[PDB]
Amino acid sequence: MDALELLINRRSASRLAEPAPTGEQLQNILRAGMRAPDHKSMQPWHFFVIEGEGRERFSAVLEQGAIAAGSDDKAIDKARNAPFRAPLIITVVAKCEENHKVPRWEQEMSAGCAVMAMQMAAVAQGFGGIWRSGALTESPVVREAFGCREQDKIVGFLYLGTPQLNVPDPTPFVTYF
Amino acid sequence: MDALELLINRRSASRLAEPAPTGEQLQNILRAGMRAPDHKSMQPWHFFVIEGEGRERFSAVLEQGAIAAGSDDKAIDKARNAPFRAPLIITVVAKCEENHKVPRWEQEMSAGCAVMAMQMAAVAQGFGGIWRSGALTESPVVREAFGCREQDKIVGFLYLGTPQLKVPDPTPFVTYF
Ligand SMILES: Cc1cc2nc3c(=O)[nH]c(=O)nc-3n(C[C@H](O)[C@H](O)[C@H](O)COP(=O)(O)O)c2cc1C
Ligand SMILES: Cc1cc2nc3c(=O)[nH]c(=O)nc-3n(C[C@H](O)[C@H](O)[C@H](O)COP(=O)(O)O)c2cc1C
């Protein structure tokens, strides 16, 4: 696939199904993430691969987090069922470290860019996915499940799988200095 | 170039020179930027294209900002000459709005992703680019120059142009849930 094409036509897919990326195709996605912009080369991030059985555990953690958050049954139910919307979910956590001419937000930024890079790496390989977050990224139980320290932050839950689904116009968003 | 290849070998290039991407080449870069992930499609960004004489005013602003921040001689210097390190610069501002369903940081990361996408679009076309920031992204006069409101944020100064000069291992970064 052409790189420029990938970027200009990039799209997120929410309707995902098996097969999910695996073997080298999955490692290629993880490798793309490692190439995200990174101020001072701090590699401020960690990836969690959630497939098959993992989804069950991930389900339980999210439901627990919702309960603890004081969410109503409707919310708790949506949380418990969240993981089963894709065959694979990659959680991205920004692993930050005290300033280094690099404020915390920039380190979190790099981790974020990693999520997009991986989403694109899935597309480049015949797969697809969508970057999701939600209030549960701030849940203590959820954070603990992904080893979040005080300065760490869950930047996204990347849902991936085989998708089953006019030229962009940037003029309204551009100004010539 | 090959998509996967660009994602797995994405590199930033400092030390850039004339000519800068123009016409469809430049539009293709702005088009990629507006295809970044966007929670609730808020399109929380604005792209400031800086080139030619526009770089003089940018220089004046940065310089004024450094002096105001109390930076030393050498820092104020690098600040004033900064804009001339590339023929083209695109400043990306995160234009944030209260959403309740989309916290501020999520809109900021979408803008941040636009920068990466724009840097990649440049590379996909044979050009080079580097995402820069520094303490001046917070400077009142610089922010004022790019129409930043209290909730807006300068996420990066993307240097673009023609580059010079002629597989990662994610194992330690991957946890299997
Ligand atoms: C939010 C953000 C801000 C950055 N700011 C700077 C900067 O001011 N100066 C710089 O040399 N690199 C900066 N970087 C890092 C470069 O874009 C680039 O990733 C790094 O120089 C390593 O080169 P590579 O991208 O080829 O690995 C920043 C990265 C991010 C994500
Ligand atoms: C940090 C971040 C968090 C996001 N969280 C969600 C989410 O929880 N649910 C959702 O439907 N979309 C979410 N999105 C947006 C989607 O990933 C996607 O960009 C959007 O549905 C539009 O589709 P497109 O990417 O094809 O333009 C998020 C985007 C970012 C940058």
Q: What is the SS3 string spanning B74-139? A: HHHHHHHHHHHHCCEEEEEEECCCCCCCCCHHHHHHHHHHHHHHHHHHHHHCCCEEEEECCHHHHC
Any B CB within 8 A of A9 CB: yes
Q: What is the sign, positive or negative, of the torsion defined by CA atoms of A25, A27, A30, A31?
A: negative
Any B CB within 8 A of A94 CB: no
Q: Which ligand is nearest to the CA of B163?
A: 1
User: HSE (CB half, 13 Å, CA atoms) of B27?
Assistant: 8
* CB contact (8 A) between residue B177 and residue A43: no
Long-range contacts for B54-58 (Cβ within 8 Å, ≥24 apart)? B54/A176, B54/A177, B55/B83, B55/B84, B55/B89, B56/B83, B57/A177, B57/B145, B58/A177, B58/B83, B58/B89, B58/B145
**Known binding residues of B for FMN:** 10-12, 35, 39, 131-133
Measured distance CA(B6)–CA(A9) in Å, rounded: 16
Longest dimension (CA), chain A: 53
Measured distance CA(B162)–CA(B177) in Å, rounded: 43
CB atoms within 10 A of CB B149: 11
* CB contact (8 A) between residue A46 and residue B175: yes
Measured distance CA(A8)–CA(A4) in Å, rounded: 6
Is residue B136 within 8 Å of residue B70, measured between CB atoms?
no
| Domain residue ranges of chain B, discontinuous segments joined by + | 1-177
Helix axis angle for B104-124 and B24-33, nearest 10°, is: 150
Closest-CA distance, B68 to chain A, in angstroms, reads 19
CB atoms within 10 A of CB A177: 18
Resolution of this deposited model, Å: 2.0
Measured distance CA(A47)–CA(A158) in Å, rounded: 10
Pairing status of strand A88-94 against strand A153-163: antiparallel
Closest-CA distance, B161 to chain A, in angstroms, reads 16
Closest-CA distance, B41 to chain A, in angstroms, reads 12
**C-alpha Rg value of chain B to the nearest Å:** 17
**Among the listed residues A32, A137, A128, A33, the one whose alpha carbon sits nearest the alpha carbon of residue A87:** A128
B173-to-A27, A153, B98, B107, B150 alpha-carbon distances in Å:
11, 15, 34, 26, 36
- What are A127's two structure tokens? 């797969």
Any B CB within 8 A of A160 CB: no
**Among the listed residues B1, B21, B9, the one whose alpha carbon sits nearest the alpha carbon of residue B159:** B21
Is residue B35 within 8 Å of residue B71, measured between CB atoms?
no
Helix axis angle for A73-81 and A53-69, nearest 10°, is: 160
Pairing status of strand B88-94 against strand B174-176: unpaired
Sequence-ordered list of residues with C-beta below 8 angstroms from that of B41, at least 6 positions apart, any chain: none
Q: Is the CB of B163 under 6 A from ligand 1?
A: no
**Architecture of the structural domain at A1-177:** 3-Layer(aba) Sandwich (3.40)
Q: Which chain B residue lies closest to A100 (C-alpha atoms)?
A: B134
- Chain B residues within an 8 Å CB radius of A131: 37
Measured distance CA(A42)–CA(A88) in Å, rounded: 27
- What are B4's two structure tokens? 């996967």
Phi, psi of B6 (to 5 degrees): -65, -40
**Among the listed residues A98, A123, A122, A109, the one whose alpha carbon sits nearest the alpha carbon of residue A156:** A109
Q: What is the sign, positive or negative, of the torsion defined by CA atoms of A46, A109, A117, B166?
A: negative
A166-to-B31, B114, B157 alpha-carbon distances in Å:
12, 19, 29
- What are B150's two structure tokens? 């209290």
Q: Is the CB of A106 under 6 A from ligand 1?
A: yes
- What are A108's two structure tokens? 């979190």
Measured distance CA(A159)–CA(A131) in Å, rounded: 6
- What are B26's two structure tokens? 């430049």
**Among the listed residues B139, B133, B138, B156, the one whose alpha carbon sits nearest the alpha carbon of residue B46:** B156
Helix, strand, or coil (residue B156): strand
**Known binding residues of A for FMN:** 10-12, 35, 39, 131-133
Nearest to B175 among A47, A116, A175 (CB): A47
